[PDB]
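Input set for joint prediction.
Command: fold jointly, output tokens.
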Amino acid sequence: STGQHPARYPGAAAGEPTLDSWQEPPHNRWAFAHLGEMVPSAAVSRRPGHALARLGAIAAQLPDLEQRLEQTYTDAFLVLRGTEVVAEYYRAGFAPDDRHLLMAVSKSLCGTVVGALVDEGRIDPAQPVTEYVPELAGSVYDGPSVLQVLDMQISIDYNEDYVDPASEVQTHDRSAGWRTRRHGDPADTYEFLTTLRGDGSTGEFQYCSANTDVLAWIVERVTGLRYVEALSTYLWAKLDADRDATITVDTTGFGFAHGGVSCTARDLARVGRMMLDGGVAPGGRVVSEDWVRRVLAGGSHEAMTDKGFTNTFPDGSYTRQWWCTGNERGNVSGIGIHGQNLWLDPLTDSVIVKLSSWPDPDTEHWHRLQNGILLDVSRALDAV
Amino acid sequence: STGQHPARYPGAAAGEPTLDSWQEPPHNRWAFAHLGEMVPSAAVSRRPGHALARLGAIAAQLPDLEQRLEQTYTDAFLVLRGTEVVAEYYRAGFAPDDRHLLMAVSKSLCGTVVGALVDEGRIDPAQPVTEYVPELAGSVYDGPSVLQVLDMQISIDYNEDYVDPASEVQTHDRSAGWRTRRHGDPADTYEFLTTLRGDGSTGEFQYCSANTDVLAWIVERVTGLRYVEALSTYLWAKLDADRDATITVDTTGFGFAHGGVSCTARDLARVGRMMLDGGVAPGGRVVSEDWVRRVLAGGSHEAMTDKGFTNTFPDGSYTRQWWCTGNERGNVSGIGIHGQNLWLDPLTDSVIVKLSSWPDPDTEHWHRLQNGILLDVSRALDAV
Ligand SMILES: NCCCCCC(=O)NCCCCCC(=O)O
Ligand SMILES: NCCCCCC(=O)NCCCCCC(=O)O
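tokens >
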């Protein structure tokens, strides 16, 4: 068993409603107001064709920028310098206020929610995961600290290969509803997480999407809130965002914390703005000054043995669900597959959002092109 | 085979993407911007507990109105007199701008889209269904006219019982994704519709949710648009609505035309306002003056043999996806199970929206209470 989880609505039994019960009372009062949480749904537009390019301020220094964005399958691109939007691009068919899947940029949002609860003293990163989720006893998460989950420094038998049909990634997807279930698959994300094992070693970076969903589970046990609601209460509702974000949910209503958030480019930039403002957003403080400082400082370099990342960023590292380049600019970024970045450039007090749809999830080729763009744009923002 | 359907996105193969392919190219460019269409998803609120009652203008004549609304499981209630909102109620936990499932009030919206295409001369109600959907040859829809579909005057072997697990209603739900699929179930709504049979007789009213989805299929074949888009282009985008509506979609992306729309109470009222304005909305004419006049006029009374409806409304009838009371006020209404009404009161130039969640889909008890409220409120709007 996976223990207590936040009810889908006040008074709801465990796991209720399901696809087969949502039309029945008492579930239907909630379900009729939230049907998209149960059944795939399309927007019927209240508004009655070509790319929008407003690169302007940086166009002079990067003349071929629009072409470079096209070549990296860019859907939305936005540069926020200070509080000002100084450059924007949206592909044909994607409106400025359309939402876009963040993939693992979602992880950086989850880490922020954890940080908020650390600031409140409700989570101690030094404590073992099992202090908050006892039901993870007997799994690979039995022993490691919350900080080791945050920093992805737990050795886990989990093949994070996004194209291999046999990988734990796909089983993770099937358990959560991103792919069609197979017979024998775990019923939900919580159950899947408890099946994970490892050799017990810690301290070396291993990127594993399961870690973030464990963080979200901790958030739920500490707050009593559905992760969906915690993500709003501790982060999204303080941003003065233009639109709600969305997050996919599994059959229990658990948000897909490691990859399932969608939002507008402009609103995602507000998360970066909060980070460069020492953790404060328009609606109040989100995380502590110290938390932000530790993110910008980076993780242990020696833990970072991912040759892929360090080939580009030799002094790079990872901490608290952020990638840290360790480059001369101190760039830090949320990253999601197929070309999602929430990229911070503290030197120029700027945030770069790039949301894309590369044909491939993760190759050296696409990252070389993408990082070239983000670095060039960052440098174009320097005083001259 | 069910023939040509509108692609989910430009250039998409038939049936693409599926839950298992949406992360792959070329699907992922579309899917990353529309993930809610593929995977159940929750809103993450951008906004940081008790019922809102603003009945006022009619409160004096109906002192116990709020209690009566509570007793009928009212979630949202709104009265539009002319262009003015003169009364509103929202239960605790439901915000004024929250969306609510319409159930079969959705049918009246679909009929409106059909009406728009009739006004354009792209649909002739006198023509057989098979003029537009040849693939329905061999089914119960082989022979009947489009108007007979619109008026629900086709005898069909289809048990429209919402609680019986053996009914065609539930098979319809399973085919479309409202309930969990069983082995052997049709793959999508189109396939399900082609399995329907009847004795061949027409002319008598038989309420059948399949009829509306056949209408939506016709809309798609005539326009080349996904029903989701047609519902926007021909109706929703002309309303000057506050919010998008939503509609659930099946695995091909086909909107659940007969019951799956959700919208705000205020925006639903704009549909009623359009009907009482002779078919014109802020964004342009939606349907012809003649179409609206025929809706208000009613269908054939002799076709209406539903003892349930006629017990309350002896001179009642049904036409073009609207229920016509035939009462002394000429009231007409969209109706959906569990207490949804888009109720028109032409005498007072008023629209009443009531969106509810009765524990039961359809009983004499709930309809007696609900109709009592709608009639009392209508009469309270009369000059005195
Ligand atoms: N389970 C569905 C996919 C989950 C999202 C995975 C994701 O977005 N991963 C990002 C990996 C970034 C790697 C960056 C690098 O190595 O340089
Ligand atoms: N397939 C899922 C449910 C489809 C919605 C059915 C629905 O809303 N039906 C309305 C029936 C109204 C009957 C009114 C009366 O008889 O007075």
